[PDB]
Amino acid sequence: STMIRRNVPTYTAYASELLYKRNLTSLFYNMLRLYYIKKWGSIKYEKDAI
Amino acid sequence: MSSLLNSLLPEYFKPKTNLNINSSRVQYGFNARIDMQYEDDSGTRKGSRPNAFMSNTVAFIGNYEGIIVDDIPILDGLRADIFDTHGDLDMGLVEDALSKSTMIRRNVPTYTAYASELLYKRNLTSLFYNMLRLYYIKKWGSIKYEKDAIFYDNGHACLLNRQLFPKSRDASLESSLSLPEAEIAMLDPGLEFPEEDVPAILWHGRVSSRATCILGQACSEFAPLAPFSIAHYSPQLTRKLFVNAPAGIEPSSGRYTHEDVKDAITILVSANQAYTDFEAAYLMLAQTLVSPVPRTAEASAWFINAGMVNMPTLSCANGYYPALTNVNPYHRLDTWKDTLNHWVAYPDMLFYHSVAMIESCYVELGNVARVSDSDAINKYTFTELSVQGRPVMNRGIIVDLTLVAMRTGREISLPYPVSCGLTRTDALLQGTEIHVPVVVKDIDMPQYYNAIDKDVIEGQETVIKVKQLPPAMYPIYTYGINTTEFYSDHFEDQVQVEMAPIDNGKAVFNDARKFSKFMSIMRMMGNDVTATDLVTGRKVSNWADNSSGRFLYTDVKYEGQTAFLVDMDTVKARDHCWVSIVDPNGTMNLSYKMTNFRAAMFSRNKPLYMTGGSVRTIATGNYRDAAERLRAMDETLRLKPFKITEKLDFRVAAYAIP
Amino acid sequence: ILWHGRVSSRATCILGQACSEFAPLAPFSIAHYSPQLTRKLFVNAPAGI
Amino acid sequence: STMIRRNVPTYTAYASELLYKRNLTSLFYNMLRLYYIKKWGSIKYEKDAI
């Protein structure tokens, strides 16, 4: 899947180290929290409540 | 691929060779005979339009921008000996082939080492693409673009060419581009080590004075003034280009005709054995030759931001290895020369193949935009499930060919999974509001269109908020081959609106489906109906187009609950050849029938006629049967005699055959 | 030694340090004392180093 | 082969000695040590430690 075949040995070496640590779960977690902060963003917390 | 784009054309359509285009706007369509009928408790009222013209306006303008991307190598052309059983370059047979050749003996060891990198640089698609554009620039060079011209107008809203295309000066297509020439150097056969990042091509005999000027301009930056479709922005392909021609390269002439570009292409494909490269370039240009004029005012959202064209980097290492190309090439499919042979015979047929492809795509993107994200085959994931290959990235031709496969309902097969050309699905995948500019004509505009202002004086520049993208084209060539209920492109159709005499003309359509068919058939009958939504309080008019003459449900410009009040004592007769609804009572039954079809084209409000010879379906067998024949009549001048015959007069002579 | 295509800018630095004396300060197991393997190393690469 | 013709006789004479010099174990050993030095480079050694 390339015409420039000089970079294949270098590309393979870096790919082998990175593929065994791929995880986007933490990014989606924060993106979901930002959705609900904006939607339900009129809830009041009073300190001297029960 | 000439074959698959040919099948898209209708059965009644019989095309000829020459098409004398003399403008930047064409109304392609057909003439049909519509037998309309209105049945009621009182009686039946019959009408008949003998020549009904259903058209789709297509222009030669459209903002595009080229970017140089990395794409797969096309291995068709190289000799079949060096390839192994599986079909990849077995290095070891390459070293064997170079050794037993007419190469300099001191270069064999150093050239063989480079082979591992350079032999996998085979993609001439970018060069053929630019050379095809130069052919059509010089042919249709007299077409004009005016700055303060009408891009769209429907009576209420108007959209000028100044609005969509700023930085735009008025000029002819010939006077648009001023291409500078790249250096065409001669390759020295006795060069020590090959220079990578500089492509070297093959040539038959001597490079002519005009061939230098064409190749020089093809490998250069396109910097246009007027926004033309065949003269869009492209980056510099290369700085220098080597040509392995033992006969010296003549210097640049300066001038050339469109016939000289055909001469340049036919020599380049034959020498390099690059037919699959040409097939890729033919399909690329088929997408980005003509762009559709939008059907409605709010269907201009597709052409606001410039769609990127993916041109694969120019890379060729045939000049350095002349031995590896010969008369016995490796090819996957047997019908691999069919696309070039079709273009050389009928160049002007590309116009018909282009409109067939964009009409197929923009129709399917119409009914793809109306599916919810929560589904299996949706907006984002319709390309992945359809594709059964291994392309680098799902872009360019893959997205356009998969939309054609959905329209026709057939299996499209290409020899190489190449991913180059225009990407259309840009505004769709974003999934945000688009702000199209508009200049107002009347003062009662913002009731109909979802405008930003509620009161606007005439001649003011306003903005319309488009959320869901309406269909840009109506199906005309693909009419009643794969019918859907959205477009309702049937030959026979009927609708039953149920009213009682207690109701004083006023009917409420609870159903959305039959409301669409009622409003559409009433427009065929030449009646101006104006419905009003009860929930929201907006208004819709069936007369929202001057081309097709149909009403799609996306003309409401709002998704909500369906409660359309239509008052049937405010119906106005607008067009000629029309049936009258004077005063209805009881149940109404509307119906029509389309019987025959005749191909028609319009340009500058005049008929555009097809001229020249009768175009045939060129097959691989039709030429190679004459190769099987060889003209085997032994080339021997056999002169047969004529015996003179005497009759009554004797003054005059008469010769007989035996 | 032999090589595929061009010897990269970083490959020169690695081969240069691999064929050299290890003179450590701290007694580490993967950085123990080793003599100079060779002074010069040829590389048959038609594409220049 | 693709060798220079004037070198064939002189190179063939040397073959008897040079072709039996094949041991790259020392080079691979040092290159493997450079891999782990740069990977686990942040480990520390204190002089007055237990």
Swiss-Prot record, chains A, D:
As for subcellular location, the record says: Virion
Function statement: Capsid protein self-assembles to form an icosahedral capsid with a T=2 symmetry, about 40 nm in diameter, and consisting of 60 capsid proteins asymmetric dimers. The capsid encapsulates the genomic dsRNA and the polymerase and remains intact following cell entry to protect the dsRNA from degradation and to prevent unfavorable antiviral responses in the host cell during all the replication cycle of the virus. Nascent transcripts are transcribed within the structural confines of the virion and are extruded into the cytoplasm.
Membership in a protein family: Belongs to the totivirus major capsid protein family.
This chain's protein is named Major capsid protein
Query: Which region of the full protein is contained in this chain?
Result: 101 to 150 of 697
